Design a protein around this ligand. Structure first.
Ligand SMILES: [Zn+2]
Ligand SMILES: [Zn+2]
Lengths: 248, 76, 112, 48, 24, 91
RNA sequence: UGGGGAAAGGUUCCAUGUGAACAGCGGUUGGACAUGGGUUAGUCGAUCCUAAGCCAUAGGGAAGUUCCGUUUCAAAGGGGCACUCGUGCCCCGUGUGGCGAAAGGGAAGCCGGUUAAUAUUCCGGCACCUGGAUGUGGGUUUUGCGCGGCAACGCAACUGAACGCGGAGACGACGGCGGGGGCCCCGGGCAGAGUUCUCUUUUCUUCUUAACGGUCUAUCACCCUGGAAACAGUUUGUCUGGAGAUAGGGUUUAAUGGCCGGAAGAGCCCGACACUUCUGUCGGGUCCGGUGCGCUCUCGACGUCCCUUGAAAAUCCGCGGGAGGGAAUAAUUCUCACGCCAGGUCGUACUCAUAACCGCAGCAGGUCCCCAAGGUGAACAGCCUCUGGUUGAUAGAACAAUGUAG
RNA sequence: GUGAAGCCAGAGGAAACUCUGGUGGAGGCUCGCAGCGGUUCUGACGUGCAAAUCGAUCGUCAAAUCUGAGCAUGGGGGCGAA
């Protein structure tokens, strides 16, 4: 046989990501003395839309503490922000929607977004349209904080990690049906070449492990082990269970 | 092409170090007299409707340059 | 009712091959190739077109005298005129509120 | 076409002084609604 | 304001000054 | 002169896509094309521009909101609790 | 089946002559044969900038031809001035290389004539852009770097280094509405032509105005006075208004609008004289209105759709800031007017297709665009005609079977 | 051709509310020219005009439509609404 479809996607010839219309990536500022001991301020100049994503972005302008110049950054916008607002960042900044605080200067129960997994990586944890993370408890000795993730899992991150207050805008984007093949095509045609997906049961035995036959059927089991050979993992990988879930 | 509203500045143009040529066209149908002069960069035109200021002016301009009334039907 | 033709080698209608039908002193219909249209500069912080400034291509602005490319006040170009008034008012008030707060804090601290 | 004709006539009357702004406004909205069919009908309503 | 104009005007000024200095 | 009795804005879809999907998309479509009163200037001149962006036609301010509504119930609850939480914690 | 082009073709373009061969018949004809001639650019392109993408440099793999790597664990640059003179001095720095578009971005030329064959290039006239040195007129100053308007702002000028901020280049698809150029249509007038047994104050043709400048206007928008409910203004389409409407008065972005220069001396239409040619010449004319869900291009204010929001760089301008420099017999770094010099290299003929390209060929196949008249008619439907182009596909005679098409 | 939201006016009712006439121009809607495709005649030709063409009849036609140039993927490899 030949190489099956999900092996060709690793070469990166046709299945790359379209990035002509993306202007910059979304990150925080780098750690610096000012934000680590006090606070700094910036202006919200514009609120823009970048293709291939929910969660509109916000352009913020800060001054420079060491040179005569002005720097501009791009954040993800929380529900409530508006052009012309004043945003603050640092250890001693008040906690209102929009602000940027080290996660240790925060009481339990507040929701944040765009949290740093390690201080300085510039935001990694919750940054999609309408999601957030919750703090649960602290540990002043050997500083470390426990958080809950939008999937249910719990984690422990260092106390000097950062997070910017609020809930990511974009709301309930996935509520109305797409309702039209064209809308699905337009949705995907700005991320990747993956939309029209053919059904391995309709394939030929030279093309896919599910292959041919005089009737369309899988043949063997559909659950594939976790330590299998590259080119075999096509189906429900390492499935612990099947069927409709009941409790949760 | 450039206009000259009055007469005084027209002789000032003609009395210049590079005014190489001039000519005079008379239109019988519309009863008009046009004074054209050719400088380096531009071509300056003076329009008149009278009949006696035409000839007297012609003696006032410098004598060194030449004047040829344009002839109807000019061959290559 | 005569029909016309292009006069350059580009046969395509590609937003930089602009034409105009004309009639000539010889009694014929010809085409002139015209350039693109100018555009008027906008304000620095509001976004509206400034009045009193022409609309040209970005290179023709180098042959025109200065008093034709600006207006006679502070922030002549790039600012409309209503937005500049806000700048004076805003600047003055912030300075006034600054000194009063500073004197209030120091005098209060002196009291202790 | 019909809408322009009616509106053109109405401004003439208001400027001349044959009517005032209250009657003008009432008739303008009465005209946007399909009430008057042509120029003759409009003047009759004004006269009454 | 192109660099050319700034450089051209200064060069023109210097050339005129040099001529005056030599005559003196 | 009602031209319909129940279909409404979802009448452009004709007889396609199935009754329940048409009726279910109406809930978001009706509120997305609506017009809301501004909060900064007071005029009723706010309309949607992008998937999460709203702007006032008169004051030119721009605000980040929900997907199909200027605000969402989840966000409003959070702001009230957080404001209440901060005040007691600092008092 | 007209008039011109991109890819491709490569002398097939024009003139003179011609035995055989080729043009599935002939041939005095030819895209065939023989001998000569023909392609002129500061303004049209390439040259300049980057896009998807390709390749050097610092490094690390591999026995090796070489694979990765493009800002990465690199000591990576560029700006100013003076001597006697090359040598010497003084400042700013994370650096940040090349290639890649004849449809993307982009400084600048129009009309008339001319050759057997080229012309936005040649000839005549009238212009424009960039670069470089310089003078006259005017402007400013003894209060050292201009005045006027309440204001939006105006004018022939009217200092501005380092550093920094902003604008233009710079952008989707569709729907109706309004302004402008071109074409189409109707009436009158002057010239020429067609028809006329009968009728027709008849039917047809010409009546044109370039680039580049001056001056006067033209939707949106903005400024001043004043303060609105018996609510008003208003679009084909309900938006606007104490965050200041109606009304009155003003400033400004935008001519493919009117008048003048260019420009009548041009071009075109008639009439009258000359004569082997070389040649020509002298009279007239080249106006005034109307209309429109008309066709085409362009501009402007609106509206709709998106889990879709619809490129980057070179180049140029404006502002904040105040370094340096500067007169009282002149001084002057005035983006004002006029005046001086120069603008290198390659392509430019012709076809673009029922014969110049690809299909073994002079093959009913295939191959990307621009302009688009009259009538019937809802119409780029079908049918007939004008400008323009063809009359080229082996022929003559008779009308049986069987055929193909109607 | 049909005529979705939004807007104007009028009429009926004690009220809650309901009717009627216009305006407007949405839709992977519809008839139908050019382009694109290739259902039937199992038509023509079948040492053809042609190593896939010709004629009539047909499918779609404002969007998952048609198309030029520049660039990328190279053989047990690519690409594939299969
Ligand atoms: Zn402004
Ligand atoms: Zn508002």
């Amino acid at each position: 046989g030949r190489v099956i479809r999900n092996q060709r996607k690793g070469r990166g010839s046709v299945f790359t990501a379209h990035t002509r219309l993306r202007k910059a990536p979304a990150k925080f500022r780098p750690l610096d003395y000012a934000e680590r001991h006090g606070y700094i301020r910036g202006i919200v100049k514009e609120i823009i839309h970048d293709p291939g994503r929910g969660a509109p972005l916000a352009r913020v302008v800060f001054r420079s503490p060491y040179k005569y110049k002005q720097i501009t950054e791009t954040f993800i916008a929380n529900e409530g922000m508006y052009t012309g607002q004043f945003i603050y960042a640092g250890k001693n900044a008040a906690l209102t929607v929009g602000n940027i605080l080290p996660l240790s200067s925060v009481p339990e129960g507040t929701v944040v977004s765009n949290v740093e997994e390690k201080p300085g990586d510039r935001g990694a944890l919750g940054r999609t349209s309408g999601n957030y993370v919750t703090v649960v408890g602290h540990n002043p000795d050997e500083g470390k904080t426990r958080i809950k993730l939008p999937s249910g899992a719990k984690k422990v991150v260092p106390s000097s990690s950062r997070g910017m207050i609020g809930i990511v805008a974009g709301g309930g984007r996935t509520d109305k049906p797409l309702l039209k093949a064209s809308r699905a095509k337009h949705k995907f045609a700005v991320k990747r070449n993956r939309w029209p997906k053919t059904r391995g049961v309709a394939m030929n035995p030279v093309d896919h492990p599910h292959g041919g036959g005089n009737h369309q059927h899988i043949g063997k089991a559909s659950t594939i082990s976790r330590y299998a050979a590259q080119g075999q993992k096509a189906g429900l990988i390492a499935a612990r269970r099947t069927g409709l879930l009941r409790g949760t | 092409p450039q206009e000259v509203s009055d007469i005084k500045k027209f002789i000032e143009i003609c009395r210049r170090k590079d005014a190489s040529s001039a000519r005079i066209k008379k239109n019988p149908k519309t009863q008009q007299i046009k004074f054209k002069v050719r400088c380096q960069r531009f071509l300056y035109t003076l329009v008149l409707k009278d009949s006696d200021k035409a000839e007297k002016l012609k003696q006032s301009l410098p004598p060194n340059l030449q004047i040829k009334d344009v002839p109807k039907r000019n061959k290559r | 009712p005569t029909r016309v033709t292009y006069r350059r080698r580009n046969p395509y209608n590609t937003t930089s091959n602009r034409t105009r039908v004309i009639k000539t002193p010889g009694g014929q219909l010809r085409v002139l190739h015209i350039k693109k249209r100018g555009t008027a500069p906008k304000c620095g912080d509001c976004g509206i077109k400034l009045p009193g400034i022409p609309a040209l291509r970005p290179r023709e602005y180098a042959t025109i005298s200065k008093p034709k490319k600006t207006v006679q006040r502070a922030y002549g170009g790039s600012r409309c005129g209503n937005c500049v008034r806000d700048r004076i008012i805003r600047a003055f008030l912030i300075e006034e509120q600054k000194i009063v707060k500073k004197v209030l804090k120091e005098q209060s601290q002196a009291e202790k | 076409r019909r809408q322009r004709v009616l509106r053109r006539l109405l401004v003439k009357y208001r400027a001349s002084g044959k009517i005032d702004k209250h009657l003008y406004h009432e008739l303008y909205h009465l005209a946007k609604g399909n009430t008057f069919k042509h120029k003759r009908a409009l003047v009759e309503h004004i006269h009454r | 304001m192109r660099a050319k104009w700034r450089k051209k005007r200064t060069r023109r000024l210097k050339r005129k000054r040099r001529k005056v200095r030599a005559r003196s | 002169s009602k031209r319909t009795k129940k279909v409404g804005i979802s009448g452009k879809y004709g007889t396609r896509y199935g009754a329940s999907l048409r009726k279910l998309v109406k809930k978001q479509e009706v509120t997305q094309h609506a017009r809301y009163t501004c909060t900064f200037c007071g005029k009723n001149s706010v309309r949607r521009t992008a998937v999460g962006i709203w702007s006032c036609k008169s004051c030119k301010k721009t605000m980040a909101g929900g997907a199909y509504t200027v605000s969402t119930p989840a966000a409003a609850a959070m702001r009230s609790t957080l404001r209440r939480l901060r005040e007691i914690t600092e008092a």
